[PDB]
Each structure stands twice: as C-alpha cells, then as structure tokens.
Symmetry: C5
Subunit: 311 residues, 5 copies
Amino acid sequence: VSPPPPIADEPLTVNTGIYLIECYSLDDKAETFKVNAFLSLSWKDRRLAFDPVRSGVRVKTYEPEAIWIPEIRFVNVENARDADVVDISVSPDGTVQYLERFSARVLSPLDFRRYPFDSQTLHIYLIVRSVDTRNIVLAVDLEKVGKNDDVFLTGWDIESFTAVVKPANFALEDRLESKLDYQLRISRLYFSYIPNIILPMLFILFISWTAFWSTSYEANVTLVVSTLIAHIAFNILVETNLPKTPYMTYTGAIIFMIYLFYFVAVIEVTVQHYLKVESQPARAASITRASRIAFPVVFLLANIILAFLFF
Amino acid sequence: VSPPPPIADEPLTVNTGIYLIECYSLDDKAETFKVNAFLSLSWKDRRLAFDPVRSGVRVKTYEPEAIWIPEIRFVNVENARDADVVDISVSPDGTVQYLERFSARVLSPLDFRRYPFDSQTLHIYLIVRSVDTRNIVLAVDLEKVGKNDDVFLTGWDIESFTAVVKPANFALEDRLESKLDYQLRISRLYFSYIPNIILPMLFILFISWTAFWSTSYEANVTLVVSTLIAHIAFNILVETNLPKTPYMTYTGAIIFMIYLFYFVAVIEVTVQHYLKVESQPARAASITRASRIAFPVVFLLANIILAFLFF
Amino acid sequence: VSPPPPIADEPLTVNTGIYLIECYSLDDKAETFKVNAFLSLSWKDRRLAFDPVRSGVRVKTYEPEAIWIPEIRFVNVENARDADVVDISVSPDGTVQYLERFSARVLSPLDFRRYPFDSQTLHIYLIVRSVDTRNIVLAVDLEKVGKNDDVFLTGWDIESFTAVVKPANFALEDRLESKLDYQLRISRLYFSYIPNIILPMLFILFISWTAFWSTSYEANVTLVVSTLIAHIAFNILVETNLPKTPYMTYTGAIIFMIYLFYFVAVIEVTVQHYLKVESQPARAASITRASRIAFPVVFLLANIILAFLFF
Amino acid sequence: VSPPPPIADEPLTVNTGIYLIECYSLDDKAETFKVNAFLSLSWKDRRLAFDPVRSGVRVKTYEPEAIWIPEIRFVNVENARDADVVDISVSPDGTVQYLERFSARVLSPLDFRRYPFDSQTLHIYLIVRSVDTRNIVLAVDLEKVGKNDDVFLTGWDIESFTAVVKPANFALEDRLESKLDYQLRISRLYFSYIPNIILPMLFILFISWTAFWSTSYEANVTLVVSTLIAHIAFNILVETNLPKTPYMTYTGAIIFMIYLFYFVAVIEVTVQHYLKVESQPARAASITRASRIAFPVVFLLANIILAFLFF
Amino acid sequence: VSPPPPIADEPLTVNTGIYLIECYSLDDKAETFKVNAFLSLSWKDRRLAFDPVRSGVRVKTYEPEAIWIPEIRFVNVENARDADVVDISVSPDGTVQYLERFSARVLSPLDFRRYPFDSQTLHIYLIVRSVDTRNIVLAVDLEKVGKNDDVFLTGWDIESFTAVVKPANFALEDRLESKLDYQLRISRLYFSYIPNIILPMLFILFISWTAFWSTSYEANVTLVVSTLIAHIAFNILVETNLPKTPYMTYTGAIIFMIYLFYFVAVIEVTVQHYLKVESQPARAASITRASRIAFPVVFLLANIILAFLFF
Ligand SMILES: [Cl-]
Ligand SMILES: [Cl-]
Ligand SMILES: [Cl-]
Ligand SMILES: [Cl-]
Ligand SMILES: [Cl-]
C-alpha cells in the first residue's frame, strides 16, 4: 500500500486526538510516566471512496493490513508504543476514521526546585515523517482530545490535558516532519509533608537548642552531637520521600541550613565552655543568653529569605 | 466477518464472567495487582444457528478467525492482557460460548488511612465499543463469575469476588460504550502488627519516661536523646512494613504523636533541671512527679481520641 | 484437527512427565520460582496408526500443525510458559510421543514459621480441559518424571521431585478438568545462621547485662540504651537475611523476646537506682544480685518454651 | 536477494549516520545508556538503477523484503536493537537511501576516578560483516550525523555527538569486518556536590576537632566517637550519590583520609589524657595546643596533594 | 527438510564455536551473567554438494528455511537465546558454514568463600538432541572459539575463554544427547578492598582498644559500646560491597571475629571495673596492662590461622 495522491499541490492533513484512559507510574527519578490511551486519526484517501447504494453499506470497516495508514510516532517515548487497533471506518467519500489503544512510557523532564510545591507539564510529542511522493501535516481535532475523569496520579492534582493546535513543521535528514505537542498539567499535593518531614525534623533541631539553658559541657556535647546523629538518622528515614537531584531543591536548601545550625551550635557550646575554662564567665553566659534569642530569630529570618528566594 | 444483524432496533447483549484462577503480586505502592483468570462471553448470532438433526451434531466448535467475536477490553489495565482462546462453542440457536484465559496487571486505587485495619475493593473494568452497524451492551452471567478456593493473597483475607450487574453505558468519541464493574473485596490480616511494630516501639518510648524517676541531668539527657535515636532507628527498620503515602495513615498519626512525646519529654527534663539550677527545687520535683502520671494518661487519652478519629 | 474418537464411552488418558533441567530464581518474598524443564506427553490416536512394512518406516515424526495435540496448561503459573517443541513421534499403533522444553515462573506458597529450619513443597499444577466431543484425564508416567543432578538452589537442599499419581478431576465452567500435582521438596540449609544472625545478636544482649555488676546509674544507662541502639542497628543489618511476613516466625519470636529483655533490664537499672536514691540500698543491691542469675536463666527457659512451641 | 556485484575489485561503501532523537537511562552502575535514534544508510546497487522516462517515476520506494540491504549491527549493544524501517528510496542510478528508527541499551565503559568532575565518551560501535562474494567498508556521511537540541541527560552536559570517519577494518572468523566509532561526549554537572556531600561532611569532621579546646576525657571521647558515628551515618545517607567502584575515586580518597583523621584524633585525645594521668601535663597541653594548628593545616595540604594527584 | 543421511553407521559431527562479542551483567546474587556472542556451526550435507564450474559459483548462500540446520540449544540458559542468523555458506563438497549472533542470561554457579580473592569458571553448556533417523555428536573447532579484546567485566580479570574438546554424550528420555562445555575463567580484582572495607573497619576496632590506657568505667563503656555501634553502622555501609551467602566467606569470618573482639573487650572493661570495685586494684591494673599486648597479638594470630584456613 502507497500514500493517497494529491489532486492539487496540497499536503495530507491527519486529524489527531489523544484520550487518556488511565495515566500512572510517574518515575520522579527517571523523569518517566506510563500512559494507557486512545489515539484517533482521520484523513481523506479518495481511492477508498464508494457508492453506498451499490455497496449496500453506509460505512466500510477495514483491517490495518488492507489499507494505507500514516506512520505516526512519538518523539519522547522510551521504546515504541504497545498499540492495538480498535476500529478503522471508511465513509463513502474516502474519509478514514482510525482509532487505536496504546500504552507507552513517556519521557518528559521534571523540575523539583520548588519541592513539595512543584508543578509539572508533561509532554507527549506526536510526529509524522513526510513521504517521498507527498508531504504530511498534522492537526488537532479538539473533540477527539480529552481524559477520563477517573485518571489518578496519587499525591498529584491532574489539572488539564491540552494540546498546542499549532504543529511545528520542520526539516530533518532532507525531509519535512510535522510535530504536535500534547501537554498534561499536574501540580503536587503533598499533605503529610509537615507531619512526615518538617515537624519532626524541627523538634530534633529544637532539642539541640536546650544547650543554651545549660552550663554542663558534658551534657551540652551529648545534647548537640546526639541530636546531630538523630538529624542524620531522620534524613535517612525521609530519603525515600525526598528529591534525588544534581541541583538544589527548596527542601534541600532547608536541610542544608539545618546542618549548618548544628555546626554553629557546637561552636557556641565550645565557646561557652572555653570562656568558663579561661575564667571569663561574664562573656561565657553573655554568649549563651544571646544564642537563646539569636539562634531562633536568625533561623526564622534565614528560612524567610530562603523561601522567598525560590518563590 | 461482520456483526450479527438485529431483528428489530435492539442492542446485542454479551454475557460476561470472570473466574480468578490465581490472583497475586499486589503492589501496595503502585496500586497494582496481577491476576491470571478466565473470561467467558456469550451472545446470539442467528446466522450461526443450525438444525441439529440435519447437521448430525449437538454443538459446533469454531476457530476465532472463522466467526465474529466482540472486541472486549479492560479500562484499568497497565498494558494489554495476555489472553489465549480456550474454547468457542455454538449451540443450535446461534448462542456462541466463548472462553479465554488471560493475565493482566490491574490498576485499582488503594486507601491506607486505616492501616493495618484497611480493607480494599479491587476494580477490574470491562468495556465493549459499539460498532457503527449495531450497538453492544454488556451483562453479568452470575454463574460464570467466581474464584478458585486456592487464590491466595498473603496477609489479606480474600472476602468476595462480585460484580455490579448494572453496566454503566456512556458516550465516548461519538460512540456508545458499555462498562461493567468487577469488584474484589480484600481485608487486611496483619497479625504480627503488635509484636513487630507497636510493642517494641512502645518499650523505647517507655524507657525514655524513666527520666521522671531520676534527677541527674547527665543521665536524663542520655535517656531522652538516646531513646529518640533508638525510636528513629526502629522507624528505619519498620520502613518496609509501613505505608508510603501523601496523606496521613492511622499508624502514621501514632508515629507522629510519639515524636511529639519525645519533644515534650525533653522540655520537662530541661525544666526540671533549670528549676533545680535556679534553686526552686520544690517546683522542680513537683513537675517531675506530675509528669509520672501526666505523660502516660495524656498518651492514653490522645491515642483514644486519635483512634476514634479514624474509626 | 479434531480429538481422537473413543472405541467406546472411555476417556483419553495423557501420560505426563516433567524433567527439571535447571531450577532457579526462588523469590522468598513473591513466593515464586522459575523453572526451565521438559514436558513429555503420550496418548493413543488410532487414526495416526500405520502398517510399518507398507510405510517402510518404524516411527513417523510429525509437525505440531499436522496432528492433534492436547491443550495442556499450568494452574499456578504467572504468565503462559515459554514452550518449544523438541520432538513428536508416532509409533505404528498410534501412540504419539510428544516432548517440549518450557520455562515458567511458578507460584507455590511459602511458610517461614520455622525459619531458618523451614522446608517447602513447591507445587506445579498440570491441567487439561476436556473437549465437548470426549473427556480427557491425566496420568503420571513415573519413568518420564525426574531432575538433573546439577539442578541447584543456593542455600537449599533439593530433596525430591515427585508427583501425586492421583489426578484430582473436577468441574469448571460446565466442563470436566483433570489436575495433576508435581511437588518439589526443598529444605533450608542456612549454615551461617548462628555466626551471621544469632551469635552477634546474643553478645549485644549480654553486653547489656554487665549493668548488674555495676552501680553507676550514668554507666548503667549508657550500657542498656547504647546496646538497645546496637540491637536495632544490627536488626537493620540482618533485615535482608530475615523473613518479611504478616505472621510470626520462629526467629521473629526470639527477636521480639530480646526487645522485651532490654525493656525489663531498663526497669531493673531504674529500680536499682531509685532504691539507692530513696536510701534502701539493701533491696537495691538485692535486686541487682538477683538479676545476675535471673535474667540469664529466665532467657534460657523462655527460649526453650519458645523453641518447643514451634517444633 | 544477493549483494551488488562490483564493477572492479573495489569494496561496497555504506554511508552511515546516526541522529539521536532522545538519549536517556544512563546507568552509572551497569555502564549502560539507552538511546532512541535514526540510522541512515546509503550504497550503490547498479542492478536497481532505472531510466526515469521509461519507469515514469523519479524515485522508487521499496519494501525491506524486496531488495538487498546490508547486515549492519552494533558491537556494544545488550540485546539486538528495536529497529523499525522508516523509508527506503532508490534513485535512478541505483543509490539506495535507507532510514530506520531504533532503540537500544548500549554498553560503553564509565570512569569515575575524577568523580564528580568526571567526563565520559560514550561509544556506539557500528559493524558490517563482509560477504563471501564482495567485501564491505563503512563510511560516515557527516550531514546524516547529529542530535536533537532537546536531548537531555539530567545532571550532565551533552557536549558533542561526533564520529571517527576512519573505519577500523579487521579480520574475524576468517572474514573482513568494518567498524565505525560513534562517540557521545558528556561532562558531569553536579552542582549540589558541595552542599549535599562535602560541606556537611566537613562540619562533622570539624565538630570532632573541638576536642583540642577541651581537657575533659569524658567530653573528648563523646566528641570524637559520636562524630565518627555521625560520619558513618552521613556516609550511609550519601551512599546513593556516590560511585560504587572496585578502584579508588577522587571522592573515595577524601572519604578514606577523613576516616584516618578520626583515627589520629582519637590517638591525640588518648595521649592528652594518658599524659595528664601520668602527671606530665606540660607535654599533655603541648600536644593538644599543637593539634589545633596541626590537624587543620595537615588536612589542607593532604587534600591539596590528594587533589593534584588525580588532576 | 530432513537430516543428511550417513554413508555408513556414522554420526553427524557439528563443529561448534562461540566468540564473545560483549560479556556483561554478572549477578553475584542470582549467579547469572548476560552474554552477547557469535555461534558458529559446520557439518557435511552431501545432498547440498555442487560442481563449481557448472554452477558458476565458488560458494552458495542459503536461507535458514531453504536447508536443514541442526537444533542446537543451551542447558544452563534462563529462557531461550535471542539469536539472529548472520550467514549460511555451502562449499562445493556440502560443508555448510552457519553463523548466528545471540544474547542469553546464563546460569553458572558462583563461590565466594575466598572473597575478595575468589575466582570463577563460568559455564555455557551446548547441547544437540539426536534425531530418530541419525545420531548427532558435537565437536570444538578451536579457531572459531574466542573473545573480543574489549570484553569487560568491571572489577574482574577476564582470564580465558576455553572449551573442553571432549563432548560428554549421554542418554535422556530414551535418546542420545551430545554436551559441550564452554568455560570462561574470571578472577577478582578488588583493589579498593583495604581502603574501602578493611582499613576503616580496623581503625573503629582500634579506637575501642584505647580503653586499656584508661581507668574511667564511664569513659570505658562509652568507648567500647560506641565503637561497637560504629562497627555495626560501617557494616551497614559495606553491605553492598559484601557477599550475600548461606555459607561463611573469608571476609565474613574476619567480620565475625571482630564482633567477638568487642565482646571480649567489654568483659575486660567490666572485670577491670569489678576488681577496682571489690578493692583488688593490683589484679585490676594487671588485667588492663595485659590486654594492651594480648588483644592485638591474639587478633594477629587469629587472623593468621583464619587466613591460612581458607588459603
Ligand atoms: Cl512511537
Ligand atoms: Cl485489555
Ligand atoms: Cl501454561
Ligand atoms: Cl544490533
Ligand atoms: Cl537456547
């Protein structure tokens, strides 16, 4: 089977449409997401036209083998989609109505700089390589584009499944290629963030600060070092629930600052001691009393600057 | 092969039935479960009818190729099912008796808010896309719906495999679609919950409370901080056995409250000390003696409120 | 091709036999095991019979397409087996000698209640669905059932590959089905159990008991709490080597009791102190001296009761 | 279905070209990377030549079956590529223009000796086995070699996709084989290295050094041992983000030196004590005061030697 | 197509040869290794013989369909190999020259008793099941057996790819089977063993021994228990880099002995104290002074006995 010849110097337009049946398995690491959906295509193959009175039928159904179907592919798929033809329906003028059900692991990039307040746009790029006998351009049939209301992505809000109606046609390896963009907007919904990650991580840091209402260097050391280990222990626990990135996340910035607040604390404790040791206990208690208000206020301000810096 | 024409303006009813052979691989994370089962279908194709005395046979067996079979699919499957035709049997009136054996990873959502007392309902949605020449509606043949007594899901009680006899018919991409709901009820059976998760997590919290029958700030600090690290260490150990959710679980609420009870404890210990340090040892021991009854009773009440709040 | 007609009202018997070539990949979690083996089948198709003098041949070899072969399947397989026909040989009386080489992930349940002294029986269930024209019953040909001497399952002793010659025939979806049971007996061989898991877990518990030959509440606390953390640390280390179950294991029972022996220990230490603190040092040292013999003996007895309870 | 006969004794040159569509899944462990790309090939099969006036066509398009295509393979692929023919175009002189779209997991080795400053060269080796009737040599058509601007490898800078135009021809199993080298240059971009790995690992080491401005052997021990455990705890946390190699990495060298700086520290602390214990408190404080400048300066120099040694 | 008839009562010899292209993915756990290679076969089918002057050709190339090819398989493969025919060449005497490129996950057993000094022999078993019309024996063509110089197995030294020229012919399911053994010798090259695993594990054990140059039971307890936790912590870190076996490894024996050296140490510390407590400080310091030389020397000897015991 060969492409349908053009009556005039015109390209064939293939009216696309993707309906998400079930969208799942979003790999925050691999920047992948698996989607099970419907692809719909329509074009005019005048060779396939018929007289309905003579044929005794209003619409003829054909097997993929039997007729010409355009080589539609995806740019950002891992390996080729696991498609299965659902229906092929030729109207008496030659307007083929194709529908397939596919499932493919897509590769859209993810940004976690604002984690756990991050929001994504998941791309699904449709392409069609123009043949040597006639060029092919894509088009979005807005009716045949949608999503099932039951489509669920646990911990995310599935905002909208839209499509840039504008196909960015370009040249590749001395041939025209028509490219459509299907964008799936999702926004994070991490509820348990504060009780699971921040709130307990804050208490461990606060427990460390009880070393300013103490003067025992033996108690002070246990207090600061022990809480530091408790901090690292808890970080190991929330390793799962955290973004594993080559850049700095919003949450990653907070965690880092907390490591520093342990470091500064130890300095205070060591100073408070070395002053008392060197018999200057005025400046010793002056520094401890200061820290009481200093450490918290500074932390608050720092976390404000920090926050606004990302948002 | 074309669909069977109606006698009048009626739709074709396809009598479904799923028999679970072996149900396994329930991913508590991915909200998936793999199932190996039998799909049975029945409809009336009057073209296929015969006079048994003339044909000399009671039932004729046909190859899938040879006769018309309806395109039945699943909505919530990951990738297409690994089906295989077992038998096709046409009775003398045209009633085709189809049977296939399949295996597919299903996507039903899971709720762990009541963990480890949670109970699920696992959905398997059957669909059939109506042809352009006649519409198709589904039906449940209650007899052909069941499960093998040996079907095992370790740590769960497989309650019932039922089906909502009511097919929710709807319109999609300008065509009718009939949808059936097959629900598999499972309820958790986590026996070792108390000895594996709660009982050792309780002892570690109690060990921390022995700081109210002490007055040594050096011992008190070691006691509370060390048990806090022991708590976090044990949490890392039961990380496996716990639900990894964006919402709060019943168990997750208990764990959180325990983090707080360490925080409050440290405050007590710091207060008991700062009072003794500031030479007010009456209010110092008053607070320690109070906590002895306070901390436990409060914890008990809190865990009662907590419990009833989920149940 | 259609089934071989009976002489009279008798069923066709298909003589089975499975020879394990290589048995591997036993998932203690998923309760699966992968097996690469030979399936052999024999039945009498009198239509296929020949006069060897006329045909000039002793045995005729046929292609699977060419002749009738019974639909043999497995009940507890994950997805369909990766079979490949090795040989089909018809003797002059019609006795077909079929042989295929397959590979399938089986689903037999595992019991770890006696871990690491547990022993399993791995089931491979063979079925054959009776046709509408004649019923089919299975049979074991003891000669064609065996295993390669090189079949290895690391850490297990492959005891015996046997088969219950009795096929449990039953009714399913209005038809007879013959079911054979192929059992593979394996017994655990965990040598390094004592040096890897128990022996170091015992020392950590003993180190904690050196708090009865001490009177320093500062030393006593460090001793008990630190060893408790060491205990939990080591439990995290042997998490791999341990059974992850919703029930109680033999080993899991020991581990739990050890958590309790830390709890009781802390009570002793706190009591020894609170008595010395309240100036009753007779009952203080009496309790410490007692524990010296008490804690060990009690532990021994408890571990005896415990052991006999499972065995 | 036979190769094109040579005009003279010269070999057939097949003009190659790979265009990376989407490059992803770089396994730092398995030394693999998955790539989805276009392979383009061109050669002259004079048998396929035509007179365009007589044939009434400018360019003839053929099915892979219909014409001779050279057996092109990859050396370093895991399993065979998931290729799909996009277009085959024969010009009137016999110049075949082949294009396929493939996806294969490649096996290029990785070197992490300079981690996280490492830079790789990812090899994709193209081969063609010379037939018994005529030899085949490869060639790079620089125009048909490139990459999509959107090709992303998270945490890496995709420098250049080049090809050594020189095909290294050699003999294998008594036949000529032409081998082309496609090199993909990538350089690491680990931004968060200092805040995620080094900076907190440095603070923990510094906290340990506060034992030189102390004289309490009880505090000194807690200080050094606790930080050592905090060190090991943090190493467990950054286990993910680190190279798991049988050789020494740059980072691995730093980590090792840090383990040693804890060891030397403990010696100091033990010495400072044993001197004070043996009533030689001049050499006791002399050693502590020394370490104050010693430990840091030595560490700095050591890390300089260390650094220059890899770079 | 049927097998080539013999001249007399002789068997057909098929000259084998495997050339490793890329050998990778060695699972130390699953005892598997994936290999991408060339399989070459040669036999004499006198039916296929030709007169080169009449045929006008030196060598004729045939499609797998067209001529008879022997059913060669592997014994220790997981699932069937992903083979692809590269070339079939018949010389004028009937000597067929077959070549295929395959990729299969092999199952050879591994021994880690001498870890990280272990050395393996990786088996690839070739078999051919003799037909009912003529028997088939295998043979090694030493020329067609080899490996690519670039074949890499990270952390191992690929010593030699050899083959036992002696095919172990045997009877299975009433038929002859010829079995060839292809052995791949590999020896471990774990360079970073000492700096990554032993050297830091030694320091942690030595840090514990600084309790013999101390008399503070409070310091002594912290010292020994803390280092024990540091030991367990480091063991968790090197869990990756270690062999997960049901038997005892060389390394596993060292680790165990170290657990014991902590146990003995605690006893010393407890004794040194209980003697000083019972006012016998001569035997108290005598035991501490002894241990100073005892513990190290004993450890050295023990590690010598230990070492020689495995080697
Ligand atoms: Cl695609
Ligand atoms: Cl489906
Ligand atoms: Cl099966
Ligand atoms: Cl390839
Ligand atoms: Cl094979």
